[PDB]
Amino acid sequence: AANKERTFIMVKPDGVQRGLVGKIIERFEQKGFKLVALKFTWASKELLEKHYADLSARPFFPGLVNYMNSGPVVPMVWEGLNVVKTGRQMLGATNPADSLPGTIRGDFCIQVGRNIIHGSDAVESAEKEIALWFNEKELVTWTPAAKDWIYE
Amino acid sequence: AANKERTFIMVKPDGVQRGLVGKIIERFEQKGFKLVALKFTWASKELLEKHYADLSARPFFPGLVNYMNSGPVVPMVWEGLNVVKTGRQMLGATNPADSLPGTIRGDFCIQVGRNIIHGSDAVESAEKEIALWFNEKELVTWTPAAKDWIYE
Amino acid sequence: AANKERTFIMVKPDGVQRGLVGKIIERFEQKGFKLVALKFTWASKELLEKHYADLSARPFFPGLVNYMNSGPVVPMVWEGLNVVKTGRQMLGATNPADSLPGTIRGDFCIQVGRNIIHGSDAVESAEKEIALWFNEKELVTWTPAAKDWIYE
Amino acid sequence: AANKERTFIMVKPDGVQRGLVGKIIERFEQKGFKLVALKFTWASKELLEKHYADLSARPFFPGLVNYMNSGPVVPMVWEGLNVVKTGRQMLGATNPADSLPGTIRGDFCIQVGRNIIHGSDAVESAEKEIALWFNEKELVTWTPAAKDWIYE
Amino acid sequence: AANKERTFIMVKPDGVQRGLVGKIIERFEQKGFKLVALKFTWASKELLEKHYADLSARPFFPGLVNYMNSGPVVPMVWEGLNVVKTGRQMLGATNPADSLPGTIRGDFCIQVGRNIIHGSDAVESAEKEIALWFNEKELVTWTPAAKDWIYE
Amino acid sequence: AANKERTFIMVKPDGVQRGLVGKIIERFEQKGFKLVALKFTWASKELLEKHYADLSARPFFPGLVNYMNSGPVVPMVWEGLNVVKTGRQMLGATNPADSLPGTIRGDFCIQVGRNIIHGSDAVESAEKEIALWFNEKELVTWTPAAKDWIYE
């Protein structure tokens, strides 16, 4: 129930370009979270406008959609107790300048427009993002051998 | 075209269960190789027997297909000059016992039946494997920013 | 004197099971702390009940003892300026979800009941714990060659 | 010009003696910061007192200059958006005791007098320090291939 | 049975002094070998002379014993399929200069007289060494949760 | 005498561009070798033609001089027992395709014209290269605290 919460994590074009895919996945594996879905893909503007629908009436929305469609991305779904919230703590503050050393953004990037990764900000939106990026078919259910040493 | 050679690499169920996905991906990214495709999935037996078609007459063929259908896998495609042969060197000998330290199998596993990873043995087999596991829609073509620093 | 303070650090059953022993010891070594004692053992309930004597009346007490007796543990002693306090900081908050990235619990575990490690909460309790877990003969006294580059 | 800010970072004698030069450099490279200058040298006292001019009235000033002249150092300049302040965050609090895990001092050292590294505290001091330690001939101007993936 | 083989691995005084304890243990853990015994101790000459009994007549014998008695050591027991032989492979050649990169000696040391680690040369000698260094009571028997993903 | 042998190691333009400076230095520090000189610089064609004088009458010499003058390089001098020979083993085969995993080239690059690093091939040429790249002033003499644990 609580251990079955899921979040959407995506490596952005700059994360892929800078060779940080393996490193980012390692952080989540290490922590004990469970990989549920993963894929390498070039997001379409139609999909990005959906993903960024809330930036619609904000200045320079097109430039955001064009940047995000400027290279391949790595969408993922991780499962675990409090993964949405904990996953965001792990990524660090959205604005890299505010990210602490030890977090993904704090260790690997500098500017907010090139902040290498995305993570759902709430359970509700994680629910929305996952359904937008993956078919229920792409979500894999399995059981880790070490499950009992991770959760009581 | 030389630098465009592609090979199929797959993290087996034991690799996923032991949390080695990011580490394996990282070895390829740091080397200079280009990720072309990636997904997390549970392989069906019908797909496994195709993938294993060559071992059809083998007495261990049934248990093999059986084992590979016992947990999720991470198939992927990497591109780069001579990647089939070099990808093989990186993985190390098929029997971990012969794999040298520094290789993936040599560093992370012990026995042949739990050798954490698969790699195409030749271009002709890489082509078949890639086509077996991926649809052409899933192979992403993009250009790494450091390409001229990797290849002349 | 201040530099001779010691604390008791112990890898719990889940840390051993999840293969974090070397990683945890590494964190203390790279920091500059001196290893004073180390062993691998399966702790008896008698011993665990003395270690947890203060919680004897709690309703969870018996469950806690059975768990700590469910797998081997790695008890150790570290020495250095303010090691009890700094030791705690390096471990992170007891509840991993409150542990920040960069700490041992922040990077490697998720739930409080599976929080992989223990560290004395005070000089007083560290003294008590060391006496409980080790004999005088097990505490090694030596001098690090890098001593003058770690301390003024 | 924003992204062209520069700060002075120096590996102190204890950092060199403890073999932390590559690790320190790696933290800056992975973050996205650009190396502008670097050298290995034994600093004279006359240079140290200039570098430490501000602490002239300090009772610990003499021993400080003394200590910093006791082994070789690795001065360097890094460039990047907001590098003075961010470089400071990365290093962690000046007193390692207050430095958090994840920072350089928090992860690698224990006491203030052996705090392995120096970082400019402000732009005005970075400018002076850079000019004190390096000749203009030694500051290299070049462009990283991934610049557009780090800054917009 | 074949999987129950054990070997004796010991970190020498120089490995402890150079802070390689956690790194060395890490190599064995990530590989899949099971930790059976571990301790930190200062070895007596009496004990060292029994460990090196075969070299009693060599002219260097006394110098070797004095050196091995000059700092604490970390004796341990590892268990797994072909561990004595694979253990040796992971350590590299006795003389570090002949040790290949990726091995423990190849990556971390230089001269034969300061070769940081020891590993039994055969099943026969491993049995003898374990009895010399540990009591029956110090050998821990447990089952790794990942066992079925390491062995067929 | 033998422990005082030195070699010239230089990170090439592609090594700097790919952010491998810290990593390469770490390998040498880790091994136990001693840093004697280090600097970040843009090599002049006049200096490169001297360095590559033996490629004079070979095809496409100019293209080599232009590539090597296409970005900053990191020249270094390391000191240690058999450092020239051992340093070359650590770098791996010149042609990356022949480099074994575990070596610098085997882990980080692909093609011979983009092989990230240079190392003197003999004591005689190390002697020549060092004098070409550094003034006797730039060579720092110091003594590591751990010297006695590295050499007998």
PDB file of N, CA and C in Angstrom, chain E residues 104-149:
ATOM      1  N   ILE E 104      43.487  -5.955  -7.118  1.00  0.00           N
ATOM      2  CA  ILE E 104      43.734  -5.188  -5.908  1.00  0.00           C
ATOM      3  C   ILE E 104      45.165  -4.654  -5.842  1.00  0.00           C
ATOM      4  N   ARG E 105      46.154  -5.513  -6.122  1.00  0.00           N
ATOM      5  CA  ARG E 105      47.536  -5.054  -6.099  1.00  0.00           C
ATOM      6  C   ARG E 105      47.865  -4.157  -7.306  1.00  0.00           C
ATOM      7  N   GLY E 106      47.256  -4.435  -8.456  1.00  0.00           N
ATOM      8  CA  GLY E 106      47.502  -3.627  -9.643  1.00  0.00           C
ATOM      9  C   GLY E 106      47.047  -2.183  -9.476  1.00  0.00           C
ATOM     10  N   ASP E 107      45.889  -2.003  -8.837  1.00  0.00           N
ATOM     11  CA  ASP E 107      45.329  -0.689  -8.590  1.00  0.00           C
ATOM     12  C   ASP E 107      45.899   0.068  -7.390  1.00  0.00           C
ATOM     13  N   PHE E 108      46.278  -0.640  -6.318  1.00  0.00           N
ATOM     14  CA  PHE E 108      46.693   0.032  -5.088  1.00  0.00           C
ATOM     15  C   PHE E 108      48.093   0.002  -4.494  1.00  0.00           C
ATOM     16  N   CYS E 109      49.028  -0.739  -5.068  1.00  0.00           N
ATOM     17  CA  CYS E 109      50.352  -0.744  -4.470  1.00  0.00           C
ATOM     18  C   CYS E 109      51.446  -0.923  -5.510  1.00  0.00           C
ATOM     19  N   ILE E 110      52.695  -0.899  -5.083  1.00  0.00           N
ATOM     20  CA  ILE E 110      53.807  -0.923  -6.019  1.00  0.00           C
ATOM     21  C   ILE E 110      54.892  -1.973  -5.870  1.00  0.00           C
ATOM     22  N   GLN E 111      55.435  -2.091  -4.664  1.00  0.00           N
ATOM     23  CA  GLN E 111      56.532  -2.999  -4.384  1.00  0.00           C
ATOM     24  C   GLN E 111      56.108  -4.283  -3.665  1.00  0.00           C
ATOM     25  N   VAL E 112      56.794  -5.394  -3.952  1.00  0.00           N
ATOM     26  CA  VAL E 112      56.447  -6.687  -3.354  1.00  0.00           C
ATOM     27  C   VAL E 112      56.486  -6.742  -1.827  1.00  0.00           C
ATOM     28  N   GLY E 113      57.427  -6.030  -1.202  1.00  0.00           N
ATOM     29  CA  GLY E 113      57.540  -6.015   0.247  1.00  0.00           C
ATOM     30  C   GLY E 113      56.469  -5.182   0.940  1.00  0.00           C
ATOM     31  N   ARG E 114      55.669  -4.464   0.143  1.00  0.00           N
ATOM     32  CA  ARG E 114      54.556  -3.630   0.618  1.00  0.00           C
ATOM     33  C   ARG E 114      53.372  -3.895  -0.338  1.00  0.00           C
ATOM     34  N   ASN E 115      52.940  -5.161  -0.374  1.00  0.00           N
ATOM     35  CA  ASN E 115      51.902  -5.600  -1.287  1.00  0.00           C
ATOM     36  C   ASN E 115      50.520  -5.761  -0.683  1.00  0.00           C
ATOM     37  N   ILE E 116      50.271  -4.941   0.334  1.00  0.00           N
ATOM     38  CA  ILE E 116      49.023  -4.780   1.070  1.00  0.00           C
ATOM     39  C   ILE E 116      48.084  -5.901   1.471  1.00  0.00           C
ATOM     40  N   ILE E 117      48.199  -7.087   0.863  1.00  0.00           N
ATOM     41  CA  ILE E 117      47.237  -8.130   1.148  1.00  0.00           C
ATOM     42  C   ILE E 117      47.803  -9.550   0.955  1.00  0.00           C
ATOM     43  N   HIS E 118      47.148 -10.518   1.591  1.00  0.00           N
ATOM     44  CA  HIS E 118      47.509 -11.930   1.513  1.00  0.00           C
ATOM     45  C   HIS E 118      46.247 -12.729   1.199  1.00  0.00           C
ATOM     46  N   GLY E 119      46.404 -13.795   0.418  1.00  0.00           N
ATOM     47  CA  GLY E 119      45.291 -14.664   0.097  1.00  0.00           C
ATOM     48  C   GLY E 119      45.849 -16.065   0.011  1.00  0.00           C
ATOM     49  N   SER E 120      45.163 -17.056   0.571  1.00  0.00           N
ATOM     50  CA  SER E 120      45.664 -18.427   0.532  1.00  0.00           C
ATOM     51  C   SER E 120      45.995 -18.905  -0.875  1.00  0.00           C
ATOM     52  N   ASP E 121      47.081 -19.664  -1.011  1.00  0.00           N
ATOM     53  CA  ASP E 121      47.444 -20.171  -2.329  1.00  0.00           C
ATOM     54  C   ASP E 121      46.789 -21.488  -2.730  1.00  0.00           C
ATOM     55  N   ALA E 122      46.127 -22.167  -1.798  1.00  0.00           N
ATOM     56  CA  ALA E 122      45.470 -23.437  -2.121  1.00  0.00           C
ATOM     57  C   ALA E 122      44.440 -23.781  -1.067  1.00  0.00           C
ATOM     58  N   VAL E 123      43.571 -24.736  -1.383  1.00  0.00           N
ATOM     59  CA  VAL E 123      42.525 -25.177  -0.465  1.00  0.00           C
ATOM     60  C   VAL E 123      43.171 -25.678   0.825  1.00  0.00           C
ATOM     61  N   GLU E 124      44.223 -26.469   0.659  1.00  0.00           N
ATOM     62  CA  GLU E 124      45.000 -27.063   1.747  1.00  0.00           C
ATOM     63  C   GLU E 124      45.560 -26.007   2.695  1.00  0.00           C
ATOM     64  N   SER E 125      46.272 -25.026   2.141  1.00  0.00           N
ATOM     65  CA  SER E 125      46.827 -23.969   2.971  1.00  0.00           C
ATOM     66  C   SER E 125      45.757 -23.011   3.545  1.00  0.00           C
ATOM     67  N   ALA E 126      44.645 -22.833   2.831  1.00  0.00           N
ATOM     68  CA  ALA E 126      43.554 -21.986   3.295  1.00  0.00           C
ATOM     69  C   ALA E 126      42.995 -22.603   4.567  1.00  0.00           C
ATOM     70  N   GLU E 127      42.852 -23.927   4.565  1.00  0.00           N
ATOM     71  CA  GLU E 127      42.341 -24.639   5.727  1.00  0.00           C
ATOM     72  C   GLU E 127      43.269 -24.463   6.915  1.00  0.00           C
ATOM     73  N   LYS E 128      44.565 -24.546   6.658  1.00  0.00           N
ATOM     74  CA  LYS E 128      45.560 -24.397   7.700  1.00  0.00           C
ATOM     75  C   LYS E 128      45.562 -22.978   8.276  1.00  0.00           C
ATOM     76  N   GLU E 129      45.503 -21.992   7.383  1.00  0.00           N
ATOM     77  CA  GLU E 129      45.518 -20.581   7.766  1.00  0.00           C
ATOM     78  C   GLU E 129      44.302 -20.158   8.579  1.00  0.00           C
ATOM     79  N   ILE E 130      43.131 -20.599   8.153  1.00  0.00           N
ATOM     80  CA  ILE E 130      41.916 -20.285   8.878  1.00  0.00           C
ATOM     81  C   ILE E 130      42.013 -20.800  10.334  1.00  0.00           C
ATOM     82  N   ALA E 131      42.529 -22.014  10.511  1.00  0.00           N
ATOM     83  CA  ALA E 131      42.664 -22.608  11.845  1.00  0.00           C
ATOM     84  C   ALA E 131      43.671 -21.859  12.709  1.00  0.00           C
ATOM     85  N   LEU E 132      44.691 -21.311  12.059  1.00  0.00           N
ATOM     86  CA  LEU E 132      45.720 -20.551  12.742  1.00  0.00           C
ATOM     87  C   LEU E 132      45.173 -19.212  13.243  1.00  0.00           C
ATOM     88  N   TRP E 133      44.433 -18.522  12.378  1.00  0.00           N
ATOM     89  CA  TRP E 133      43.918 -17.195  12.683  1.00  0.00           C
ATOM     90  C   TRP E 133      42.606 -17.054  13.423  1.00  0.00           C
ATOM     91  N   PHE E 134      41.720 -18.034  13.284  1.00  0.00           N
ATOM     92  CA  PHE E 134      40.408 -17.985  13.915  1.00  0.00           C
ATOM     93  C   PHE E 134      40.060 -19.251  14.687  1.00  0.00           C
ATOM     94  N   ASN E 135      39.125 -19.096  15.609  1.00  0.00           N
ATOM     95  CA  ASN E 135      38.562 -20.192  16.393  1.00  0.00           C
ATOM     96  C   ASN E 135      37.285 -20.529  15.666  1.00  0.00           C
ATOM     97  N   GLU E 136      36.779 -21.726  15.946  1.00  0.00           N
ATOM     98  CA  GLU E 136      35.538 -22.251  15.374  1.00  0.00           C
ATOM     99  C   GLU E 136      34.397 -21.304  15.600  1.00  0.00           C
ATOM    100  N   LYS E 137      34.391 -20.736  16.799  1.00  0.00           N
ATOM    101  CA  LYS E 137      33.369 -19.808  17.249  1.00  0.00           C
ATOM    102  C   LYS E 137      33.330 -18.511  16.445  1.00  0.00           C
ATOM    103  N   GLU E 138      34.449 -18.146  15.820  1.00  0.00           N
ATOM    104  CA  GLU E 138      34.504 -16.918  15.041  1.00  0.00           C
ATOM    105  C   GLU E 138      33.980 -17.044  13.614  1.00  0.00           C
ATOM    106  N   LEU E 139      33.750 -18.272  13.147  1.00  0.00           N
ATOM    107  CA  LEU E 139      33.242 -18.471  11.800  1.00  0.00           C
ATOM    108  C   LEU E 139      31.722 -18.432  11.841  1.00  0.00           C
ATOM    109  N   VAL E 140      31.146 -17.441  11.161  1.00  0.00           N
ATOM    110  CA  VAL E 140      29.701 -17.227  11.121  1.00  0.00           C
ATOM    111  C   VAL E 140      29.025 -17.925   9.932  1.00  0.00           C
ATOM    112  N   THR E 141      27.967 -18.662  10.231  1.00  0.00           N
ATOM    113  CA  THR E 141      27.213 -19.337   9.193  1.00  0.00           C
ATOM    114  C   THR E 141      25.851 -18.648   9.031  1.00  0.00           C
ATOM    115  N   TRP E 142      25.589 -18.183   7.817  1.00  0.00           N
ATOM    116  CA  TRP E 142      24.352 -17.493   7.510  1.00  0.00           C
ATOM    117  C   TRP E 142      24.097 -17.681   6.040  1.00  0.00           C
ATOM    118  N   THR E 143      22.925 -17.250   5.587  1.00  0.00           N
ATOM    119  CA  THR E 143      22.533 -17.392   4.189  1.00  0.00           C
ATOM    120  C   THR E 143      22.168 -16.068   3.550  1.00  0.00           C
ATOM    121  N   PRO E 144      22.896 -15.660   2.498  1.00  0.00           N
ATOM    122  CA  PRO E 144      22.606 -14.403   1.813  1.00  0.00           C
ATOM    123  C   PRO E 144      21.236 -14.459   1.140  1.00  0.00           C
ATOM    124  N   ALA E 145      20.483 -13.387   1.273  1.00  0.00           N
ATOM    125  CA  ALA E 145      19.176 -13.306   0.644  1.00  0.00           C
ATOM    126  C   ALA E 145      19.297 -13.393  -0.895  1.00  0.00           C
ATOM    127  N   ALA E 146      20.442 -12.988  -1.448  1.00  0.00           N
ATOM    128  CA  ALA E 146      20.619 -13.021  -2.897  1.00  0.00           C
ATOM    129  C   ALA E 146      21.209 -14.318  -3.427  1.00  0.00           C
ATOM    130  N   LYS E 147      21.393 -15.307  -2.544  1.00  0.00           N
ATOM    131  CA  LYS E 147      21.985 -16.604  -2.902  1.00  0.00           C
ATOM    132  C   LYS E 147      21.548 -17.241  -4.235  1.00  0.00           C
ATOM    133  N   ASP E 148      20.242 -17.318  -4.480  1.00  0.00           N
ATOM    134  CA  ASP E 148      19.727 -17.921  -5.695  1.00  0.00           C
ATOM    135  C   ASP E 148      19.932 -17.133  -6.962  1.00  0.00           C
ATOM    136  N   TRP E 149      20.452 -15.910  -6.828  1.00  0.00           N
ATOM    137  CA  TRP E 149      20.742 -15.053  -7.971  1.00  0.00           C
ATOM    138  C   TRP E 149      22.249 -15.012  -8.221  1.00  0.00           C
TER     139      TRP E 149
END
